[PDB]
């Protein structure tokens, strides 16, 4: 299912009581907008070609809304500083992620909104979009506040309405690219770099979306081999790459196989 997601970061300053606010928006794993309130006369800005098909009215309205949101997060930094009895001497962070997944009927499939303070879970909208889960006792204060004010219905109205409708609009606007998965381009490299043995490295490059599985298998053993596995990383052009490596005895390279799973592949892939 396609998704539309926003990631908000607010950071307080040990300084003049103001705060930095950064917002990024994604359709699936494709970033399409950004906002940064330290830019002069800050605007929501395009970050992918297809969203540049929007008129200036769109950018004006998105700018208005995200500037208001940044104000709200500025106040929230202070409030949470109070909840946790922290001084105004240090910098703190308030993060939110929210968004919607599109169902098979063109309606909301799953929606979410989650907040973290100083990098730890703070409060989350539950799957039913009508109740909250608080992570500690300060979050209980926030939860009582939002329950009494039916903030959950604000979230649910957005996720079931504007979120999915704007996502469908985006999928049509970027139909030339957003409907594409890119399968990994794969190869195995061999590095006889040590007396310890021969390093085999299985590479997957240029794939999209970012979810992938690379595993090494040795003939005669069912379990995956222990391996050196790097975290999935961006290629810079919107795709991703990953590799998995291990050291094998000098003459035994042929008994090892790298197995690749990605949604762009028409069958699971076995490499040597």
């Amino acid at each position: 299912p396609h998704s539309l997601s926003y990631f908000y970061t607010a950071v307080s300053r040990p300084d003049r009581g103001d705060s930095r606010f950064i917002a990024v928006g994604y359709v699936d794993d494709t970033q399409f907008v950004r906002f940064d309130n330290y830019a002069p006369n800050p605007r929501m800005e395009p970050r992918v070609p297809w969203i540049q098909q929007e008129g200036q009215d769109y950018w004006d309205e998105e700018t208005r809304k995200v500037k208001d949101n940044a104000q709200t997060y500025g106040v929230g930094l202070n409030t949470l500083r109070g909840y946790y009895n922290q001084s105004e001497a240090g910098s703190h962070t308030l993060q939110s992620m929210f968004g919607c997944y599109l169902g098979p009927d063109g309606l909301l499939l799953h929606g979410y909104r989650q907040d973290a303070y100083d990098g730890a879970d703070y409060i989350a909208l539950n799957e039913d979009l009508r109740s909250w889960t608080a992570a500690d006792m300060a979050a209980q204060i926030t939860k009582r506040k939002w329950e009494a004010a039916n903030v959950a219905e604000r979230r649910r109205s957005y996720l079931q309405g504007l979120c999915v409708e704007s996502l469908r609009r985006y999928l049509e606007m970027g139909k030339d690219t957003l409907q594409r998965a890119e399968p990994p381009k794969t190869h195995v490299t061999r590095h006889p770099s040590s007396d310890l043995g021969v390093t085999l490295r299985c590479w997957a490059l240029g794939f999209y979306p970012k979810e992938i599985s690379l595993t090494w298998q040795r003939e005669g053993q069912d379990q995956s081999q222990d391996m050196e596995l790097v975290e999935t990383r961006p290629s810079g052009d919107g795709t991703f790459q990953k590799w998995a490596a291990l050291v094998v005895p000098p003459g035994e390279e042929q008994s090892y196989t790298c197995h690749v799973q990605h949604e762009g592949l028409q069958e699971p892939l076995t490499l040597r």
């Binding site: 949101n69 709200t72 907040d115 926030t142």
Partner: peptide
């Protein structure tokens, strides 16, 4: 398009 976040924590 963005949510409208306005309620205090």
């Amino acid at each position: 398009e963005s949510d409208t976040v306005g309620w205090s924590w």
